[PDB]
């Protein structure tokens, strides 16, 4: 079973945004569908439900979104939608489409409601100082500074390096996020076998690939 979500990103307060979700692997027309959202401040919240053709696609909404959101579905496309209007900053969070009982979930998409402007990340290489010590392993990294909104995604060597990777949660400071990612590889393999961080920021349509070279 798969629920594939589309949409999300940055929207101004008072603005509108539509989320979509295409179902495959369950008989969509027989299932009630929901939207659920999640935030650090408030946790998981149910948003809206939509029922079946036999009952005229009747709906339910959380009181906090009634009159501002519309849940809809297109059974011919096996798709459920959430149209959000007059958006408020308290509406920011990760939005998931789900089936009844929350049996099947989409992957989630971050909706950020803010008047702050999209800003692409600066991606800086973290390479050890020239007088750093020697060890059988070496740690390298990338510092991702000054972007808005979330998210960014970080890979190393386009995903082929994963075992030695830690990417850290972003922190917000005055309308801009900063994140970092480290990778640890055997020291005999760098710089001979190259190591590059790839930082994708879909909101600004920018991916940066920074190769980490010795100082």
């Amino acid at each position: 079973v798969k629920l594939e979500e589309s949409g999300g990103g940055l929207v101004q307060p008072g603005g509108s945004m539509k989320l979509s979700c295409v179902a495959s692997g369950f008989t969509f027309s027989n299932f009630w569908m929901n939207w659920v959202r999640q935030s650090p401040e408030k946790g998981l919240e149910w948003v809206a439900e939509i029922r079946l053709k036999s009952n005229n696609y009747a709906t339910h909404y959380a009181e906090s979104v009634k009159g501002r959101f519309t849940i809809s579905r297109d059974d011919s496309k096996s798709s459920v939608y959430l149209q959000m209007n007059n958006l408020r900053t308290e509406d920011t969070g990760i939005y998931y489409c789900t089936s009844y009982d929350y049996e099947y979930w989409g992957q989630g998409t971050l909706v950020t409601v803010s008047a702050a402007k999209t800003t692409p990340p600066s991606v800086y290489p973290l390479a050890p100082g020239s007088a750093a010590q020697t060890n059988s392993m070496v740690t390298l990294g990338c510092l991702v500074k000054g972007y808005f909104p979330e998210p960014v995604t970080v890979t190393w060597n386009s995903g082929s390096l994963s075992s030695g990777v830690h990417t850290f949660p972003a922190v917000l400071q005055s309308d801009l996020y900063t994140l970092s990612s480290s990778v640890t590889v055997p020291s005999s393999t760098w710089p001979s076998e190259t190591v590059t961080c790839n930082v994708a920021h879909p909101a600004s349509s920018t991916k940066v690939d920074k190769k980490i070279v010795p100082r």
């Binding site: 998981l44 149910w46 390479a127 850290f168």
Partner: protein, 213 residues
């Protein structure tokens, strides 16, 4: 609105041990309670529905019980893969509501961090900034402190810290600390040090560089 209450926020268990998670409803919700497992950066997954019915594909170490206002999820023998945040939810009455979640931490042996320090890049200096980064990687337990020194003197302003969730593969934690100065201030000092203090030792793990190196 029906409130689902979960406490405590976290429990720390060794592999093989039994853990019981509790969930209190503010109203009688009959058997309309489900349990979900959520790992970081992932959607929740259904474990139990109807208070006690195990969902297809869920390992049999997971059971659910209870009714009316009190509900329990039991893991008979905790496995490393069970590292996650567990939420209950009620579907008795609209609006449907979720509990706040109990995190399950997997216990492991104490491990000191691997500490690495990095100077500002030339690219960042060109723009007028100077971030010094220290990674404190693969340690346990979770609590840790970083102290930044500039020419031997502590600096607290300009420090940004971030901690990972517990690592699925080795049950450790990691932390990144960034001291951000302007290029102007960075170029007026010589030595930059991060000191990691962790329960494994009162002696800090010290990494440093100087701008002459």
């Amino acid at each position: 609105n029906i409130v689902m209450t979960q406490s405590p926020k976290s429990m720390s268990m060794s592999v093989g041990e039994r853990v019981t998670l509790s969930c209190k409803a503010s109203e009688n919700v009959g058997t309309y309670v489900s349990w979900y497992q959520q790992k970081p950066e992932q959607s929740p997954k259904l474990l139990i529905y109807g208070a006690s019915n195990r969902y297809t594909g869920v390992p049999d170490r997971f059971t659910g019980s209870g009714s009316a206002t009190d509900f329990t999820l039991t893991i008979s023998s905790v496995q490393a893969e069970d590292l996650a945040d567990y939420h209950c939810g009620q579907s008795y009455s609209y609006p449907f509501t979720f509990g706040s979640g109990t995190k399950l931490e997997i216990k492991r042996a104490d491990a000191a961090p691997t500490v690495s320090i990095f100077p500002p890049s030339s690219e960042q200096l060109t723009s007028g900034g100077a971030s010094v980064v220290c990674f404190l990687n693969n340690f346990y337990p979770k609590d840790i402190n970083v102290k930044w020194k500039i020419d031997g003197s502590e600096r607290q302003n300009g420090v940004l810290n971030s901690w990972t969730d517990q690592d699925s593969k080795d049950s450790t934690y990691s932390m990144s600390s960034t001291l951000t100065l302007t290029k102007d201030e960075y170029e007026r000092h010589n030595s930059y040090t991060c000191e990691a203090t962790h329960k494994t030792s009162t002696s800090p793990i010290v990494k440093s560089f100087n701008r002459n190196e």
